[PDB]
Amino acid sequence: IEEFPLKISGEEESLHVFQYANRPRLVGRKPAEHPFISAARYKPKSHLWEIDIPLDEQAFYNKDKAESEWNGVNVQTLKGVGVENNGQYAAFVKDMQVYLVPIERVAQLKPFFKYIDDANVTRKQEDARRNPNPMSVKSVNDPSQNRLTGSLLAHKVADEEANIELTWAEGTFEQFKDTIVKE
Amino acid sequence: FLKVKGLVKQHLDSFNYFVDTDLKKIIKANQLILSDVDPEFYLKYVDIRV
Amino acid sequence: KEAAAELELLNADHQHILRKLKKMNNKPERFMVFQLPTRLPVGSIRVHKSGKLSVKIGNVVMDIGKGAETTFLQDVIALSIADDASSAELLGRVDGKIVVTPQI
Amino acid sequence: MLSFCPSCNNMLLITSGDSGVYTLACRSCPYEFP
Amino acid sequence: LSDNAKTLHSQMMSKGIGALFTQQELQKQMGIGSLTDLMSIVQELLDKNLIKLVKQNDELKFQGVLESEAQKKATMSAEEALVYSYIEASGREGIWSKTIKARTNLHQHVVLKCLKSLESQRYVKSVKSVKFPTRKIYMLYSLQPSV
Ligand SMILES: [Zn+2]
């Protein structure tokens, strides 16, 4: 009977979708808000998305347990690995128009506990300096020996690479009309 | 069903899969034997036939 | 028997999504994600006899099957990046998710 | 016992509080409750 | 280019071979350029194989050596000078021939064919050590039989 035509107008833009494994949608049938991002963190070649969130203050905080153990306060960060798949187009509608764009990666955000990881790296460093108890020339590739590669090599290149400090903004109309003017 | 596909179906149709296709997939997994002494010497296998 | 309980829910799944594409006409920076089949051997969302949904994204290739099916207690947000620079923009959150299935 | 801690989903733990009071609080997340 | 490398090694040979130099005093000493091009001539000086990289524990350390031994080791090939670095790293207590094979992956024939030439080049002698008798121990001509 009726028809609603659609066209795809998307190139050059690798827009991503995050998934909050903590936050539900609705609180008694009413959907809540999405929290305010303080800052972000990205590393290329491993595609991590380290999102920072800040907490509520002294009412539900218990600061004298937080200050006395780790001294890293008011920050909950969470990690999400970006994964690739085909399809999965995102669409907004116009009045009797609907325009689409391909999504390039999808990340699933799990709570990356930063400080308790950082609490023990000092504990091992002080243990060395209590009782410290005490030279590189080339070698030859041999055809009867193996070298580390595969999945743990990806962790060897995901530890030291260039961060980019994102300026988190809220735009959403510049990209909107950019699709409208393109057929 | 038994005229073109006989009574010894499992015994012959595996060995016929071995001699034609399954041998090329083995020389391609153990090719290029090398000697660390005199490193410019290499023996590599291009195909295999029976 | 239990084959009939499938079609009536997919019948009711047409109406629950036809309402949702009608309330969303006010373009209030709303989004939904859905997956198109690649590997082609554009179109138009249509309404068939008594509310049946199909797309024809090929010149002839018809895709009857569409269905709003996933239940998820997560807040998903579409956001763009560009060239590892000052390009972090939160656009909006996602209300629903449907699929597109080629009929055989 | 459905002891979900918000913003970490981890667990809850009955903590021996100040003056031996029974406050509940998990580790690895700065959260508390009477 | 070259003259900046001629200044730095004269600073490396300025002090007596001890008091092993490092970067934290080097940029105090040679800091006319930024660290981006200072390293590039030192890596070129590593390409001119004079500077070596010695280790004091847990941290980055440098050590310059004299030009006199640099010329005689440049006569050797890649694998010839490579095994000569292991014996001169040992220096005082020698080094066991089988352990040299372990630190190279070069098997028994190619290591023994190398040092057969190297003794005729008069850089290596063989001593008899007593804390493990009947083992092959190599040193320089610098004669440390502390054992
Ligand atoms: Zn918690």
Side-chain angles (χ1 to χ4, degrees):
Chain A
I1 304 169
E2 292 85 5
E3 61 180 0
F4 292 159
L6 74 161
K7 292 296 290 184
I8 49 100
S9 296
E11 289 86 5
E12 191 182 1
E13 52 188 358
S14 68
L15 59 93
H16 296 172
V17 177
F18 290 165
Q19 294 183 359
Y20 289 163
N22 291 320
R23 273 74 177 175
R25 280 186 175 268
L26 54 89
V27 281
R29 191 180 179 270
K30 187 65 64 69
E33 73 273 15
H34 62 277
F36 50 95
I37 294 171
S38 69
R41 185 183 179 95
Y42 177 74
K43 291 181 181 180
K45 294 187 287 184
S46 297
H47 303 162
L48 279 311
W49 287 98
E50 188 67 33
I51 303 303
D52 301 332
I53 213 73
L55 279 311
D56 197 358
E57 293 294 327
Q58 76 271 16
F60 286 158
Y61 193 71
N62 198 2
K63 64 182 290 294
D64 58 353
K65 190 261 186 183
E67 299 292 336
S68 65
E69 290 183 354
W70 51 77
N71 300 116
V73 295
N74 210 168
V75 170
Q76 177 184 2
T77 184
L78 76 167
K79 190 185 285 184
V81 177
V83 75
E84 183 179 0
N85 54 0
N86 290 317
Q88 296 294 322
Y89 292 95
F92 63 94
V93 92
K94 187 66 73 175
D95 287 330
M96 286 67 253
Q97 286 294 111
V98 48
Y99 291 156
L100 278 71
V101 57
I103 301 173
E104 197 269 327
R105 288 182 185 91
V106 175
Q108 186 175 2
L109 287 172
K110 299 299 292 295
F112 184 72
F113 290 165
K114 182 71 71 178
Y115 56 90
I116 192 166
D117 194 5
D118 297 333
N120 287 319
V121 299
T122 62
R123 191 266 307 158
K124 189 261 185 294
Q125 185 65 41
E126 58 89 20
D127 199 1
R129 68 184 70 187
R130 296 285 79 78
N131 194 1
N133 292 319
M135 291 178 69
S136 71
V137 193
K138 293 171 68 175
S139 297
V140 176
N141 206 166
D142 187 75
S144 297
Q145 187 64 256
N146 54 1
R147 194 262 300 164
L148 60 92
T149 187
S151 183
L152 81 160
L153 187 144
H155 292 171
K156 185 58 69 178
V157 301
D159 53 355
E160 45 98 20
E161 68 269 17
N163 189 6
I164 291 94
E165 295 292 326
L166 271 301
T167 65
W168 183 66
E170 198 275 332
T172 200
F173 188 74
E174 192 271 332
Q175 189 269 330
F176 184 76
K177 188 68 172 65
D178 197 2
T179 306
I180 302 300
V181 69
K182 180 68 175 68
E183 180 69 28
Chain B
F1 178 70
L2 272 70
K3 182 175 75 174
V4 73
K5 197 180 265 78
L7 273 303
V8 198
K9 299 179 264 75
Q10 58 267 15
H11 291 281
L12 87 171
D13 289 325
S14 184
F15 187 76
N16 209 165
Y17 184 78
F18 180 78
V19 64
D20 291 335
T21 64
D22 204 1
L23 281 173
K24 285 178 93 287
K25 263 63 184 298
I26 303 307
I27 50 95
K28 293 185 189 295
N30 292 113
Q31 204 182 1
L32 280 85
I33 55 100
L34 291 176
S35 66
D36 52 358
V37 55
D38 196 2
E40 60 272 22
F41 178 74
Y42 71 100
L43 270 158
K44 67 188 290 184
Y45 302 158
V46 297
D47 57 352
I48 182 164
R49 287 179 291 112
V50 175
Chain C
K1 293 181 182 291
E2 289 86 4
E6 192 271 332
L7 192 274
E8 61 89 19
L9 195 275
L10 184 141
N11 195 2
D13 202 3
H14 287 90
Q15 298 296 323
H16 290 89
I17 198 63
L18 185 64
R19 182 184 295 171
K20 187 60 68 179
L21 57 90
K22 188 185 287 185
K23 289 183 182 290
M24 193 260 174
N25 289 321
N26 52 1
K27 71 280 290 183
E29 295 293 325
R30 184 65 65 194
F31 292 98
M32 73 282 289
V33 56
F34 62 98
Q35 178 179 0
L36 272 303
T38 62
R39 199 267 310 276
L40 73 162
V42 178
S44 64
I45 291 97
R46 292 182 300 274
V47 176
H48 290 285
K49 268 71 69 178
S50 68
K52 293 295 182 183
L53 302 173
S54 70
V55 299
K56 180 178 176 289
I57 65 168
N59 49 6
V60 191
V61 176
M62 187 68 73
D63 291 333
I64 293 297
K66 293 194 295 293
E69 186 62 39
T70 176
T71 298
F72 57 96
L73 278 302
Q74 286 82 29
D75 299 328
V76 287
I77 294 95
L79 54 93
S80 297
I81 203 64
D83 204 0
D84 296 332
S86 298
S87 64
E89 298 88 2
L90 192 144
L91 307 181
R93 62 180 175 89
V94 175
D95 196 0
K97 189 259 184 66
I98 65 99
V99 296
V100 177
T101 298
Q103 76 278 15
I104 291 95
Chain D
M1 295 301 292
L2 205 269
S3 66
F4 66 96
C5 177
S7 71
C8 75
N9 294 319
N10 196 352
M11 188 52 74
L12 271 308
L13 192 279
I14 306 301
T15 307
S16 68
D18 49 352
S19 68
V21 75
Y22 293 157
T23 182
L24 63 92
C26 69
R27 280 88 55 83
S28 69
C29 184
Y31 182 80
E32 75 275 18
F33 188 78
Chain E
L1 184 65
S2 296
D3 54 355
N4 196 1
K6 300 301 181 290
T7 56
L8 58 87
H9 82 283
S10 64
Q11 180 62 41
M12 294 301 108
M13 277 66 258
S14 64
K15 196 182 264 77
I17 194 66
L20 67 174
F21 287 167
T22 187
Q23 194 271 331
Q24 299 297 320
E25 62 185 1
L26 182 63
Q27 190 175 2
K28 184 259 188 294
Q29 190 64 256
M30 293 300 292
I32 188 65
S34 178
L35 193 272
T36 59
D37 63 358
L38 286 173
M39 184 184 289
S40 65
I41 196 67
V42 174
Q43 189 174 2
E44 196 273 332
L45 208 280
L46 282 168
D47 289 331
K48 287 180 92 288
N49 65 17
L50 192 276
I51 189 73
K52 67 182 291 296
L53 202 152
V54 78
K55 280 81 181 166
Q56 184 59 256
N57 52 2
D58 297 330
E59 53 92 25
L60 191 274
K61 187 70 76 176
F62 284 162
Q63 182 178 1
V65 300
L66 272 298
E67 193 270 330
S68 67
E69 67 271 15
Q71 194 277 127
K72 65 178 179 65
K73 69 102 175 180
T75 308
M76 304 298 173
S77 74
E79 58 91 19
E80 288 170 352
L82 193 274
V83 64
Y84 180 74
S85 56
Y86 277 159
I87 175 178
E88 67 184 1
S90 65
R92 298 292 89 192
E93 66 274 16
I95 192 63
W96 185 49
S97 176
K98 184 73 173 178
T99 315
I100 291 298
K101 191 266 295 180
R103 294 189 181 96
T104 58
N105 295 317
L106 304 174
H107 66 89
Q108 289 83 13
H109 180 267
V110 64
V111 59
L112 266 297
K113 184 57 70 179
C114 183
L115 60 93
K116 186 187 287 185
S117 176
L118 191 62
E119 58 87 19
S120 68
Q121 298 303 109
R122 299 289 94 188
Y123 296 151
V124 48
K125 67 182 183 292
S126 66
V127 299
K128 180 66 176 293
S129 177
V130 296
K131 292 301 289 183
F132 194 85
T134 321
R135 79 189 302 168
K136 300 303 289 291
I137 295 301
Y138 297 157
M139 291 186 288
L140 298 171
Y141 284 170
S142 65
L143 194 139
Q144 185 62 258
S146 177
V147 61

